[PDB]
Design a protein around this ligand. Sequence first.
Ligand SMILES: Oc1cc(O)c2c(c1)O[C@@]1(c3ccc(O)c(O)c3)Oc3cc(O)c4c(c3[C@@H]2[C@H]1O)O[C@H](c1ccc(O)c(O)c1)[C@H](O)[C@H]4c1c(O)cc(O)c2c1O[C@H](c1ccc(O)c(O)c1)[C@H](O)C2
Ligand SMILES: *[C@@H]1O[C@H](CO)[C@@H](O)[C@H](O)[C@H]1NC(C)=O
Ligand SMILES: [Cl-]
Ligand SMILES: [Cl-]
Ligand SMILES: [Cl-]
Ligand SMILES: [Cl-]
Ligand SMILES: [Cl-]
Ligand SMILES: [Cl-]
Ligand SMILES: [Cu+2]
Length: 235
Amino acid sequence: HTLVWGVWVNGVDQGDGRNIYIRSPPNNNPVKNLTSPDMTCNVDNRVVPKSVPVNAGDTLTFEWYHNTRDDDIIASSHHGPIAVYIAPAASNGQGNVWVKLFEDAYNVTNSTWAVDRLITAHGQHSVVVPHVAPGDYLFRAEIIALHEADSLYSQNPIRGAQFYISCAQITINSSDDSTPLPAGVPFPGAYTDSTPGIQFNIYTTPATSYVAPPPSVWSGALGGSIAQVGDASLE
Ligand SMILES: Oc1cc(O)c2c(c1)O[C@@]1(c3ccc(O)c(O)c3)Oc3cc(O)c4c(c3[C@@H]2[C@H]1O)O[C@H](c1ccc(O)c(O)c1)[C@H](O)[C@H]4c1c(O)cc(O)c2c1O[C@H](c1ccc(O)c(O)c1)[C@H](O)C2
Ligand SMILES: *[C@@H]1O[C@H](CO)[C@@H](O)[C@H](O)[C@H]1NC(C)=O
Ligand SMILES: [Cl-]
Ligand SMILES: [Cl-]
Ligand SMILES: [Cl-]
Ligand SMILES: [Cl-]
Ligand SMILES: [Cl-]
Ligand SMILES: [Cl-]
Ligand SMILES: [Cu+2]
């Protein structure tokens, strides 16, 4: 159970974005239905009034929280991967449009899941803004909690993989457009009951065997990390 508070750009806090530049749902409940329209941008998918200005090559940092800003972020039980996708705003996140900019699942060296590192990072994870056409975009940040993912929602609606999905409205101003945005995948649609990483038993299967759901990260992606960029308590 987690939500996005706002974003940072190049380590500068853009301020509380809830219902402003984030398409915030009304609470931190997970999405579980893989075929639902709620998979696109969660349960209150509507245009919100602002779009955060960035440039190609900037660091865009999502900041998550549980109940209040810079709290425990998400329950430690919620082991799983983190991804970020992009789509053009005109698309309104419909069609084969979502392009993957980032994936982190399990880090064998530190023996940590993406979610564990997100807690340590005070809820912060980043992407580098790619050299796509200037204009308006949606960035879709997605946490998959696997603690009940030994079952499929479609078979048992009490259980399933849990999706914490947040869409940010981002405007890219300066960019030379040298890596024009390629075909992506639909949400809902890309994840099905047979997709690797959707049904998984984190209790019995080694984390080193986990494969995150496709698609792969776009070659045009410029980078990203789970790491604290800014200190929320210095406000
Ligand atoms: O006079 C305006 C001018 C606006 O641009 C807007 C206005 C009013 O109201 C708003 C709006 C939305 C929610 C609110 O609660 C509200 O009070 C006002 O509604 C919408 C609803 C929309 O569907 C879209 C809006 C807006 C914004 C947006 O601020 O703005 C876009 C826009 C307008 C003029 C531009 O020069 C431009 O580059 C982009 C698009 O027309 C349109 C839009 C979409 O068609 C599809 C989308 O996925 C999005 C959209 O806008 C959002 C947007 C929001 C603020 C911006 O500065 C901006 O550039 C774009 C965001 O890109 C998501
Ligand atoms: C899952 O979502 C689909 C598409 O909206 C809907 O038809 C189906 O009823 C949903 N399942 C449940 C259990 O609500
Ligand atoms: Cl659901
Ligand atoms: Cl309105
Ligand atoms: Cl960190
Ligand atoms: Cl550029
Ligand atoms: Cl690619
Ligand atoms: Cl980064
Ligand atoms: Cu939860």
